[PDB]
Amino acid sequence: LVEEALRKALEDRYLLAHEAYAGGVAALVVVHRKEVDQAKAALSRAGVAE
Amino acid sequence: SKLEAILSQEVEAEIQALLQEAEAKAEAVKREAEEKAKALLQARERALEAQYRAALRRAESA
Numbered sequence: 277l278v279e280e281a282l283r284k285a286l287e288d289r290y291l292l293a294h295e296a297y298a299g300g301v302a303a304l305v306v307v308h309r310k311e312v313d314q315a316k317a318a319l320s321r322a323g324v325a326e
Numbered sequence: 327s328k329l330e331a332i333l334s335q336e337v338e339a340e341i342q343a344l345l346q347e348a349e350a351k352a353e354a355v356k357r358e359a360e361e362k363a364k365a366l367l368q369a370r371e372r373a374l375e376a377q378y379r380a381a382l383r384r385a386e387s388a
Contacts, residue, residue: 289329307329 278303281322285315 282292282305290312292305303324307315316324 286328286332289327289332291327 278305278319278322278324281315281319284318285311290315 279292282290285307290305290307292303294301294303296302305312305315305319316326
């Protein structure tokens with residue numbers, strides 16, 4: 277559901293996963309500055325918070 | 327990764343643009359140095375032959 281925005285970004289790019297610590301899933305998404313800021317705005321529209 | 331390869335592309339593109347700018351700069355540098363040296367060498371035939379001719383003028387008159 278959050279990776280839909282990552283597929284909307286560059287699909288083979290933007291290292292985005294949640295490793296461990298199931299109290300809150302550490303969904304980290306790393307691509308760039310500008311396109312990653314746009315994708316972070318799109319993910320916060322989908323529901324996300326840094 | 328895609329942006330692995332894209333950041334490698336960005337590094338290669340900035341290095342290639344850097345070296346093309348440096349090529350244009352070095353060509354202009356050798357151009358301006360050669361123009362200055364040949365302006366020197368063009369002025370020196372005047373600055374030497376005029377002295378030689380004026381010397382022969384005053385020597386002939388003497």
